[PDB]
């Protein structure tokens, strides 16, 4: 029966859907830099 399988999928994808979203604000991005020089 598709019961003992869904019962563990709803957990291993419900906890790994919180632990994988809790570290999104911390992952690295790439930032652009700007610099004005003088004289030119």
């Amino acid at each position: 029966e598709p019961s003992r399988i869904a019962r563990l999928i709803a957990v291993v994808a419900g906890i790994a859907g919180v632990l994988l979203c809790g570290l999104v604000p911390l992952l690295p991005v790439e930032e652009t830099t700007a610099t004005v020089l003088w004289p030119q």
């Binding site: 598709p2 019961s3 869904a6 019962r7 999928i9 709803a10 994808a13 419900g14 790994a16 859907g17 994988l20 979203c21 570290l23 999104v24 992952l27 690295p28 991005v29 790439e30 930032e31 652009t32």
Partner: protein, 50 residues
């Protein structure tokens, strides 16, 4: 003016797929305790269309 890297995009996609997977698993789990309705009252009337 940041821009997401490849690791951040991969994590953001693979952690958003897991939410839908878990909700689908819950929907499949709800097939046992669902309280089936008599399935009547399937019309609207006249003074609701007006």
């Amino acid at each position: 003016i940041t821009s997401p890297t490849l690791l951040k995009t991969a994590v953001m996609v693979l952690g958003l797929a897991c939410v839908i997977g878990s909700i689908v698993a819950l929907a499949l789990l709800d097939r046992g305790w669902r309280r089936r309705p008599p399935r009547t009252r399937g019309r609207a009337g006249l003074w609701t269309w007006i």
